Amino acid sequence: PPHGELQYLGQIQHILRCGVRKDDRTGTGTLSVFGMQARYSLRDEFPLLTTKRVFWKGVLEELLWFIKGSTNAKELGDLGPVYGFQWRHFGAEYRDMESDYSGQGVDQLQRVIDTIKTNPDDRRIIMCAWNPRDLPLMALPPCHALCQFYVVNSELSCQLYQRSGDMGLGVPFNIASYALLTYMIAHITGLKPGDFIHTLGDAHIYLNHIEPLKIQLQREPRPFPKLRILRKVEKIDDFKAEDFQIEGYNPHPTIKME
Template identity: 80%
Template sequence: MWAGQLRREERTDRRGRELVVPDGFSRAGSRTSLPLKPRQRNARVRLEVLFRLFLKDRMAPGKKCLFLDEFPLLTTKRVFWKGVLEELLWFIKGSTNANELSCKGVKIWDANGSRDFLDSLGFSAREEGDLGPVYGFQWRHFGAEYKDMDSDYSGQGVDQLQKVINTIKTNPDDRRIILCAWNPKDLPLMALPPCHALCQFYVVNGELSCQLYQRSGDMGLGVPFNIASYALLTYMIAHITGLKPGDFVHTLGDAHIYLNHVDPLKTQLQREPRPFPKLKILRKVETIDDFKAEDFQLEGYHPHPTIRMEMAV
């Protein structure tokens, strides 16, 4: 979606972390024609890293991926598959407790649920690990009043995920099959506002497709993870609705690279992509809540080695 815009601006995010954003767009999305400073000129290289990397691995932002017999898990570095799987199951459960993931060796939410981080946001009364009404809560209890991570929210709010599944089964031509994590009322209560904010499902010729809108994308760490997560969600919903996975379309609002990710991404860019793996669901699952981690088998995933990148918090 940024094709042809090769000039870049360097900016900082709301916590002062340096990143690069598309030239011609300010952080608020307005046009700008500021002259490039020397450091901004250097940022052109980062844009080339961004596009060459994802085009090379066949998953360019804003582009369409046909699942066919493959699963879009990047191969130019090892993507944390266990983290993708366990986090998605955690979303589906409606959990907002980062400790549940951490106990399984998935530490991706630890920093946002830490005592220091929660205190810095004014959430001193919360238990450590309580992230507030983030993704899973919005998926399963949209509109419910959030109390804490241990409360029982059964029957409260709108179960968007189940509504999506029911609509796919009963009215697959509906143009309103949408799952949305962006709830303005709850944003002040969240440890982290949703980055992958909204997805829409579409059924045609017995295939289920998904389009994800992501307001903010950390291209080094987050986006490869998000691609796999929503591809997996599409596989799961297709399985329980009797459909085949179709297309995955990924749209990014603010695609950025943190400065400390540039060199690792250059390393990644030198690597030759390998064939995507295949994903198998090992048993017939009837409902979305019945999926377990052991139901999935990733076959033929032979990526290049892990590339270490620090997560921005």
């Protein structure tokens, strides 16, 4: 039964071979394919990629920061609404990063947790993230990412749809990130993690990443690690970095893409 990371390596191989040239916002070149999907099992393993060392400590710390709702870069400097502010205070008007937003906006993340435990069958267990630069740009701007949860047989699955995905830098970091979110939610709802499904719109490789990813393709995945939560934790806000332990992670060396 093949290793999940073979999907990622195959998608990289496909973009290299079949991707078409397409420029991004800033006019920087990519090789691009529209529409991809991959599925990573979260059952007794954790999809932290092994063909390069992925920055797990930063996945953890940034996710914890989003879950706090912070718009204070210094906790990770008044950034405006980023993934925390929209995840915890969606639609509440944003003053400074120090302000007080209790009971203000939709709390998308708590709403997710609450629906899982009031109606696990619900097909609408959805949380969206916006790229901050889109918010001033237009009325009803499109989300950057939408995440859907699904529960069957006491297992929690998650599907992330991203309207674009940077295959070299952003995608491995996001697989780990939404896998960890799924572990965290499953933990507080008394469910077992199931699958993480990653779906992209414009899946792209930046031109300056082709060579480093060409070498990464030569590497054989090792068995994924396990993730342990080392405490019975109750509310999603109560998690801290020290509650998590990655086990049996043995990646190939770091690859710098910029």
